[PDB]
DNA sequence: AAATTTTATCTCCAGGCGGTATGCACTTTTAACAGTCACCCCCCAACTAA
DNA sequence: TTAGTTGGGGGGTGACTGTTAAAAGTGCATACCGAACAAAGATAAAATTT
């Protein structure tokens, strides 16, 4: 919720502060290089950095940690119960969305076959928000054949996909993902 | 359709990407291990990448070249999991679990040498090298040292793969120089015969001259007591069965079929019910319900197996291999039978757990024997064995049944190993939960389909005992009503609970005997306990020959049922009952705002008790009718002390008068000169009227009332009815019929009698105490000396108690006057019997209260006061009676207490040689199983860390020792009677035999008692106890105290045991 | 250990509280364990009749002597109030008595349940057996047996602090709420009449008075305020569905519902009855996700009566006498 | 050390309470910054079998 | 039922390379609650108590 944004965030870890603070130097060194490589060299010198720098970063992090411990403790007290409901609903929705997103992605990574095409998807594709407006009125059909041609296309798509569906079940058994059947 | 084409090409690209990713880098079984040691990891990498023909065989020698308490619950469960995977042939899962546990540091700690050895053996049985080398890498990284079993597994693998002689010989000198011996390798316990054959082939590829040690003739026992039994010099006339060989083979085939089926079905003996409409409708509904329950059980089992498998694929232990052991149909049928056997009152959850696990192990064992091929070998060996016990067939040289069984060459009997207790309880819990959730039944049974809501058949309710609460599973009441209405005429028994149809398998070792295929235990105990078996195994092999031979002799006795008594008992049972005669009445005949409940509750309680008694009687009578025209045998085994008990519980000869009256010997014998007299004296003894009279007076009284005997034999239920006045009415009727048939025949001397005659011993415990103490005063009292009239202590105690009661009632006590003449030997018998065993006033009071409640004529309001008065007077009367008995009892109790203080349970050895141990210990902590419905609390027996229970160890040492001495006497008597051709079966202290052989049996009894008690039992016991416990060098003071206590034994008295031979009433 | 009263002002105040009814003067007072007999003298001072149910004979003759020339005000019956009507079934020893015989001796005639209160019992609960005495009194009250046969009898007794808090628990206090609280709040109206520390009474042991100052310091460690409570049985306790025949099923339902406290009502109704649990919850006006710890005693009685009033199913309960003693 | 208080009671034929809080040791999870860029999710409609 | 289909246009996570430490999860262990009523008694061990 917007009230969640109102709650303060935890202090950034020591390694990150070093990465953030030392970034503007590295835009001066080589700005065209890929950030991933640059992260490694800052880490490479975080590996070679002296212990005193780590000690001072850790002291600052501890102080900011105590500070944040204080503001968050004060802030979570003054809020209203309706905001409690808002935050709990939003976090539950966020976890559910994360779970769903992973499930859809695992499925799309496992090469699951597509569903059969539809009369309306074909109409939209022929048409090539704005489309939703145009296809709405265009849907009314004065041709019995328009539905019929679609059935033949539906029949053709269904047969190939079912052959893929019976095929796709085989490797999942071979790999070990028997539950997806 | 360009869209279809682009979709197809994208799917093809994604498939190729996934295939490449899987090939280069989901649930997949992990084979290659990850090792902590950097050098070993590099070695594994370079060996894998060395060459396609990588030197796995040479790496084997490279790894084997170096060779420089109680387990936890999780360790035991993992070991059982690995061995069950070995049996089930799901080795990839065992390997995956092993490598996964080898990954994490904490899980690495649990693994021991045995687990790696088992997985190596599994991989060797298939001959694989790569996986065996991987497991060797793991076992070497763990820091363990390979043992004999590892080298045996390697040799078996090399032999199976038909590898050349070089690697084999190399491993040979390595194992030879490391201090190991091939002879020890060929005697390992955990090695199947196929494994030894393959190892032999592999070894003979290198050294063909090597040969196993030759077989030797079995040794014979040489103990003093048992020398004559096994001596080959003398005249022997062993009994032989009357049946021919062909019938005995057919009977064996029938018993094998019954045990393979695992169930036997018998027709009910209840009154038949005409097929009304309601009965047919109920039967149709019940059949439909059974079909639906079967399908639901199948589906639930499949889903549970899938879930448990998925649990293992994450690296966690489960019960998947245990579920895979049996076929699904067998599990479904077992669950359905258990559901059908559930009583209406319900059963405890833990009891259902012990029961469902016990039935699974037996079927697993039978299936293992059936598949492994031992069944055909058993058939052949038993068919050749039966030539000894057939009347027509002959043996070249007669011998004991076990000796012949071993002489032919016994098949090498390999059975399975019991599961640990945690697995046993978890499996039962899972099965019970499956049964509970799977079954469902309609809400309205009588009305077909008014409502479609479905209610569970079984419920889970809590039963509260004092503060404690227990979980109970109770059937739905409508289901119970449906079962009652259907009234099916078929009963089901487990094959173990029904007497064998073929002669029992001889006892050759503590692991083989009794039933042909089903598992049986030589000493009965709770499931977890194993100390008794370990002591039995660690003893010399020739110690238990006497016990095994006695059990086999008792097992091979042919029985039969009495037709007339069975017919009469059916008439009373099916027609309103006769509870006076022990035949329970039908529940239809029943006695039947705060005042009404006080009557309804009593009526319901009486009805419940009558129903339970009728159910038990129904079981016994149905079994008895099913065996009407057949000959059956009853096997035997021992409790942990040595006393023998028949295995089949329902129908044996330890029951009430009905059970002991229905049975009779199958083989007969001419009465001869004294058979009729012995029959008359047995009838008088069964009557109970004359118990303090000499034999002459008993025979005279028998001759006086011959008319009553004849009348009762002719018209039992419609005559003068004299036989119902006896102490044991049903046995008396059978004896009367036997006597009438004998008398009315032409020549009574040639009559063939099938009826056993019982000879029993007076004051047996005090007869052994007086023999141990050699107390002349005690000996004369218990009929150890030649006397003209029987003498017993119990009547004297009763007389003294009555005199005290008379004197007290003179002064005006109400309780003294109320029980004016109800004082009898019966009330004081058990109390004065157990006073020397260590009974307290609490136990005596409870026993006296039980007898007074059982009087049924004593005013029941005064039971408490009467019990107190009687126990006080009895303990006052026994203040100075026994002296030597009490001295021996005190010595035994003090020794047991002092031994039990230092944390060691008491042990001793019987004069025959059977070792005995007391299993009493304190269980401080109790285990639990977290689960769905509830958490079962069980007791972990089989834990030696627990401290001994000093109360139980002192209390039971004096009673238990005397019981071991009695069993030894019975065994010696049976063994020395078998040589003379006698039929001998015993009940603890009562000996049964034919009418004509009673004199010979009495002579043998007296001689064997004298020979047994001629030996110095007490001194040998003291020496053994000193050598076992006192010799331990823990503390000098504790050992000194034990030595001073043990080394002082009571002095013997002045009594020669040879006079027992002339005692007429020693047994009578 | 007995704790008699030996303080004069305390005895006077207790006598005034016991005779706190200006109307209906003659309340026959049944007293337990009179001990020294100071509260007894105070009770006779105010004029009310007394009957002493002395549990020990060592101090009977002193009370008998004090009752001489009292014109029947003081009558001593050697009896123990907590041993009335033993269930053993044998002859009754003199420490115990049959309630019928005692009430015939005292000349008390039975009255209906809806009538007024015949008697009043004044005494103290057992020191270590309060949870036994409460259960026995509850069993006698619900079944209408023993002294409750003759009518509704008040029992005014002193109870300890912890047991008082456990007895007066409410859904507001979830930790102490249990079966005994439910049954004693459904069956009676409990009122707190007086408060008093432990040291006000003089402990009596088997040998005699506990006069050792060492245990007096230990008595401070054992000190707990003793509340005086009043229980008058409720007139509307028995309805058509809850009767002396059905009380066992109600007791078992209450014990089962508290067997697993952290569970909903439906999770227990599924294990107790074959009827539709959701229907019963709807009928008693409760949400499906209702805990057992959130139900007032009236809710429990309404639940039991609602299940019992169902006429659709012939079999509505799984409780049976076979469940008991197993 | 010596007393008081509390507990179980002759053996065998095979026996056991169930739930809720609290602590500790350990391994496994997630959020905290930095920029790049691709994928997934709409937005707003429209059908249909798994 | 519900979720997955196609059109441009819009935006929001996570892919990434990288450390750090608090928060969650896992598995065993001990303790206290229920002291469901239902008379009473004798004796000798087992445990705390001071
Ligand atoms: N410890 C113990 N042993 C028992 C008990 N009942 C029987 N026994 C043993 O079993 C033996 C045989 O008992 P019975 O045959 O009933 O009677 P008995 O002592 O032989 O005496 P009689 O009645 O004269 O034959 C006894 O001597 C005891 O050794 C019992 O309750 N406790
Ligand atoms: Mg006997």
PDB file of C-alpha atoms in Angstrom, chain B residues 508-650:
ATOM      1  CA  UNK B 508      15.351 -77.539  14.887  1.00  0.00           C
ATOM      2  CA  UNK B 509      16.560 -74.061  15.900  1.00  0.00           C
ATOM      3  CA  UNK B 510      15.184 -70.974  17.679  1.00  0.00           C
ATOM      4  CA  UNK B 511      14.334 -69.638  14.192  1.00  0.00           C
ATOM      5  CA  UNK B 512      12.494 -72.600  12.611  1.00  0.00           C
ATOM      6  CA  UNK B 513       9.510 -74.690  13.629  1.00  0.00           C
ATOM      7  CA  UNK B 514       5.787 -74.712  14.411  1.00  0.00           C
ATOM      8  CA  UNK B 515       3.834 -73.441  11.372  1.00  0.00           C
ATOM      9  CA  UNK B 516       5.190 -74.275   7.927  1.00  0.00           C
ATOM     10  CA  UNK B 517       5.533 -70.743   6.459  1.00  0.00           C
ATOM     11  CA  UNK B 518       4.141 -68.219   9.007  1.00  0.00           C
ATOM     12  CA  UNK B 519       6.675 -66.653  11.467  1.00  0.00           C
ATOM     13  CA  UNK B 520       6.638 -67.988  15.107  1.00  0.00           C
ATOM     14  CA  UNK B 521       8.732 -67.185  18.256  1.00  0.00           C
ATOM     15  CA  UNK B 522      10.257 -69.834  20.612  1.00  0.00           C
ATOM     16  CA  UNK B 523       9.767 -67.505  23.625  1.00  0.00           C
ATOM     17  CA  UNK B 524       6.651 -65.258  23.470  1.00  0.00           C
ATOM     18  CA  UNK B 525       7.396 -61.578  24.341  1.00  0.00           C
ATOM     19  CA  UNK B 526       6.380 -57.986  23.422  1.00  0.00           C
ATOM     20  CA  UNK B 527       7.435 -56.977  19.857  1.00  0.00           C
ATOM     21  CA  UNK B 528      10.506 -54.784  20.533  1.00  0.00           C
ATOM     22  CA  UNK B 529      12.202 -57.008  23.183  1.00  0.00           C
ATOM     23  CA  UNK B 530      15.177 -59.051  21.927  1.00  0.00           C
ATOM     24  CA  UNK B 531      17.269 -60.039  24.975  1.00  0.00           C
ATOM     25  CA  UNK B 532      15.719 -63.506  25.292  1.00  0.00           C
ATOM     26  CA  UNK B 533      16.523 -64.340  21.669  1.00  0.00           C
ATOM     27  CA  UNK B 534      20.088 -63.059  22.022  1.00  0.00           C
ATOM     28  CA  UNK B 535      20.714 -65.224  25.090  1.00  0.00           C
ATOM     29  CA  UNK B 536      19.225 -68.187  23.226  1.00  0.00           C
ATOM     30  CA  UNK B 537      21.563 -67.619  20.274  1.00  0.00           C
ATOM     31  CA  UNK B 538      24.740 -67.016  22.299  1.00  0.00           C
ATOM     32  CA  UNK B 539      24.458 -70.331  24.176  1.00  0.00           C
ATOM     33  CA  UNK B 540      26.167 -73.510  22.913  1.00  0.00           C
ATOM     34  CA  UNK B 541      24.126 -75.116  20.115  1.00  0.00           C
ATOM     35  CA  UNK B 542      23.674 -78.380  22.029  1.00  0.00           C
ATOM     36  CA  UNK B 543      22.067 -76.810  25.114  1.00  0.00           C
ATOM     37  CA  UNK B 544      18.493 -76.465  23.826  1.00  0.00           C
ATOM     38  CA  UNK B 545      18.111 -79.962  22.357  1.00  0.00           C
ATOM     39  CA  UNK B 546      16.030 -81.148  25.306  1.00  0.00           C
ATOM     40  CA  UNK B 547      13.637 -78.204  25.123  1.00  0.00           C
ATOM     41  CA  UNK B 548      13.255 -78.418  21.345  1.00  0.00           C
ATOM     42  CA  UNK B 549      12.660 -82.176  21.489  1.00  0.00           C
ATOM     43  CA  UNK B 550      10.062 -81.815  24.251  1.00  0.00           C
ATOM     44  CA  UNK B 551       8.212 -79.135  22.285  1.00  0.00           C
ATOM     45  CA  UNK B 552       8.294 -81.287  19.144  1.00  0.00           C
ATOM     46  CA  UNK B 553       7.007 -84.303  21.085  1.00  0.00           C
ATOM     47  CA  UNK B 554       4.112 -82.261  22.457  1.00  0.00           C
ATOM     48  CA  UNK B 555       3.398 -80.914  18.973  1.00  0.00           C
ATOM     49  CA  UNK B 556       3.019 -84.340  17.325  1.00  0.00           C
ATOM     50  CA  UNK B 557      -0.150 -85.498  19.082  1.00  0.00           C
ATOM     51  CA  UNK B 558      -3.272 -86.242  17.040  1.00  0.00           C
ATOM     52  CA  UNK B 559      -6.546 -84.877  18.415  1.00  0.00           C
ATOM     53  CA  UNK B 560     -10.247 -85.347  17.688  1.00  0.00           C
ATOM     54  CA  UNK B 561     -13.625 -83.976  18.776  1.00  0.00           C
ATOM     55  CA  UNK B 562     -16.333 -85.709  20.807  1.00  0.00           C
ATOM     56  CA  UNK B 563     -19.457 -86.079  18.687  1.00  0.00           C
ATOM     57  CA  UNK B 564     -22.063 -86.615  21.398  1.00  0.00           C
ATOM     58  CA  UNK B 565     -20.912 -83.784  23.666  1.00  0.00           C
ATOM     59  CA  UNK B 566     -20.779 -81.475  20.645  1.00  0.00           C
ATOM     60  CA  UNK B 567     -24.328 -82.428  19.650  1.00  0.00           C
ATOM     61  CA  UNK B 568     -25.670 -81.791  23.152  1.00  0.00           C
ATOM     62  CA  UNK B 569     -23.807 -78.482  23.443  1.00  0.00           C
ATOM     63  CA  UNK B 570     -25.299 -77.300  20.142  1.00  0.00           C
ATOM     64  CA  UNK B 571     -28.843 -78.141  21.392  1.00  0.00           C
ATOM     65  CA  UNK B 572     -28.514 -75.952  24.544  1.00  0.00           C
ATOM     66  CA  UNK B 573     -26.686 -73.086  22.713  1.00  0.00           C
ATOM     67  CA  UNK B 574     -29.233 -72.741  19.876  1.00  0.00           C
ATOM     68  CA  UNK B 575     -32.326 -73.109  22.123  1.00  0.00           C
ATOM     69  CA  UNK B 576     -32.480 -70.319  24.821  1.00  0.00           C
ATOM     70  CA  UNK B 577     -29.089 -71.315  26.328  1.00  0.00           C
ATOM     71  CA  UNK B 578     -28.291 -72.972  29.691  1.00  0.00           C
ATOM     72  CA  UNK B 579     -26.039 -70.451  31.598  1.00  0.00           C
ATOM     73  CA  UNK B 580     -25.939 -72.790  34.608  1.00  0.00           C
ATOM     74  CA  UNK B 581     -24.006 -75.344  32.532  1.00  0.00           C
ATOM     75  CA  UNK B 582     -21.671 -72.753  30.997  1.00  0.00           C
ATOM     76  CA  UNK B 583     -23.555 -72.364  27.695  1.00  0.00           C
ATOM     77  CA  UNK B 584     -24.292 -68.618  27.344  1.00  0.00           C
ATOM     78  CA  UNK B 585     -27.891 -67.509  26.718  1.00  0.00           C
ATOM     79  CA  UNK B 586     -29.109 -65.634  23.580  1.00  0.00           C
ATOM     80  CA  UNK B 587     -29.256 -61.804  24.006  1.00  0.00           C
ATOM     81  CA  UNK B 588     -32.936 -62.051  22.979  1.00  0.00           C
ATOM     82  CA  UNK B 589     -33.539 -63.369  26.500  1.00  0.00           C
ATOM     83  CA  UNK B 590     -32.625 -60.304  28.565  1.00  0.00           C
ATOM     84  CA  UNK B 591     -33.570 -59.145  32.079  1.00  0.00           C
ATOM     85  CA  UNK B 592     -34.885 -55.813  30.674  1.00  0.00           C
ATOM     86  CA  UNK B 593     -36.534 -39.490  36.593  1.00  0.00           C
ATOM     87  CA  UNK B 594     -33.292 -40.467  38.323  1.00  0.00           C
ATOM     88  CA  UNK B 595     -34.717 -43.879  39.276  1.00  0.00           C
ATOM     89  CA  UNK B 596     -35.347 -45.229  35.764  1.00  0.00           C
ATOM     90  CA  UNK B 597     -31.721 -44.733  34.711  1.00  0.00           C
ATOM     91  CA  UNK B 598     -30.499 -46.796  37.681  1.00  0.00           C
ATOM     92  CA  UNK B 599     -32.402 -49.755  36.179  1.00  0.00           C
ATOM     93  CA  UNK B 600     -31.740 -49.161  32.482  1.00  0.00           C
ATOM     94  CA  UNK B 601     -27.977 -48.932  33.029  1.00  0.00           C
ATOM     95  CA  UNK B 602     -27.904 -52.218  34.958  1.00  0.00           C
ATOM     96  CA  UNK B 603     -29.994 -53.995  32.321  1.00  0.00           C
ATOM     97  CA  UNK B 604     -27.759 -52.704  29.524  1.00  0.00           C
ATOM     98  CA  UNK B 605     -24.601 -53.770  31.379  1.00  0.00           C
ATOM     99  CA  UNK B 606     -25.952 -57.293  31.904  1.00  0.00           C
ATOM    100  CA  UNK B 607     -26.933 -57.473  28.230  1.00  0.00           C
ATOM    101  CA  UNK B 608     -23.445 -56.368  27.163  1.00  0.00           C
ATOM    102  CA  UNK B 609     -21.714 -58.995  29.304  1.00  0.00           C
ATOM    103  CA  UNK B 610     -24.034 -61.739  28.044  1.00  0.00           C
ATOM    104  CA  UNK B 611     -23.415 -60.662  24.444  1.00  0.00           C
ATOM    105  CA  UNK B 612     -19.629 -60.779  24.864  1.00  0.00           C
ATOM    106  CA  UNK B 613     -19.764 -64.248  26.421  1.00  0.00           C
ATOM    107  CA  UNK B 614     -22.044 -65.491  23.642  1.00  0.00           C
ATOM    108  CA  UNK B 615     -19.688 -64.123  20.983  1.00  0.00           C
ATOM    109  CA  UNK B 616     -16.712 -65.960  22.476  1.00  0.00           C
ATOM    110  CA  UNK B 617     -18.731 -69.180  22.751  1.00  0.00           C
ATOM    111  CA  UNK B 618     -19.858 -68.751  19.139  1.00  0.00           C
ATOM    112  CA  UNK B 619     -16.241 -68.530  18.003  1.00  0.00           C
ATOM    113  CA  UNK B 620     -15.239 -71.689  19.869  1.00  0.00           C
ATOM    114  CA  UNK B 621     -18.272 -73.727  18.780  1.00  0.00           C
ATOM    115  CA  UNK B 622     -18.023 -72.706  15.119  1.00  0.00           C
ATOM    116  CA  UNK B 623     -14.364 -73.728  15.098  1.00  0.00           C
ATOM    117  CA  UNK B 624     -15.229 -76.996  16.856  1.00  0.00           C
ATOM    118  CA  UNK B 625     -17.921 -77.874  14.318  1.00  0.00           C
ATOM    119  CA  UNK B 626     -15.624 -77.086  11.395  1.00  0.00           C
ATOM    120  CA  UNK B 627     -13.200 -79.757  12.702  1.00  0.00           C
ATOM    121  CA  UNK B 628     -15.841 -82.443  13.275  1.00  0.00           C
ATOM    122  CA  UNK B 629     -14.516 -85.272  11.075  1.00  0.00           C
ATOM    123  CA  UNK B 630     -10.855 -84.247  10.821  1.00  0.00           C
ATOM    124  CA  UNK B 631      -7.628 -84.889  12.711  1.00  0.00           C
ATOM    125  CA  UNK B 632      -5.729 -81.767  13.753  1.00  0.00           C
ATOM    126  CA  UNK B 633      -2.458 -80.959  15.520  1.00  0.00           C
ATOM    127  CA  UNK B 634      -1.606 -78.142  17.938  1.00  0.00           C
ATOM    128  CA  UNK B 635       1.950 -76.711  17.971  1.00  0.00           C
ATOM    129  CA  UNK B 636       3.689 -75.348  21.083  1.00  0.00           C
ATOM    130  CA  UNK B 637       6.095 -72.687  22.334  1.00  0.00           C
ATOM    131  CA  UNK B 638       7.401 -71.240  25.600  1.00  0.00           C
ATOM    132  CA  UNK B 639       7.152 -68.110  27.686  1.00  0.00           C
ATOM    133  CA  UNK B 640      10.385 -66.529  28.885  1.00  0.00           C
ATOM    134  CA  UNK B 641      10.608 -68.922  31.842  1.00  0.00           C
ATOM    135  CA  UNK B 642      10.081 -72.226  30.043  1.00  0.00           C
ATOM    136  CA  UNK B 643       6.456 -73.237  30.522  1.00  0.00           C
ATOM    137  CA  UNK B 644       4.793 -74.530  27.359  1.00  0.00           C
ATOM    138  CA  UNK B 645       1.632 -73.055  25.821  1.00  0.00           C
ATOM    139  CA  UNK B 646      -0.295 -74.116  22.692  1.00  0.00           C
ATOM    140  CA  UNK B 647      -0.183 -71.580  19.875  1.00  0.00           C
ATOM    141  CA  UNK B 648      -3.818 -71.555  18.583  1.00  0.00           C
ATOM    142  CA  UNK B 649      -5.701 -69.395  21.106  1.00  0.00           C
ATOM    143  CA  UNK B 650      -9.388 -70.006  20.393  1.00  0.00           C
TER     144      UNK B 650
END
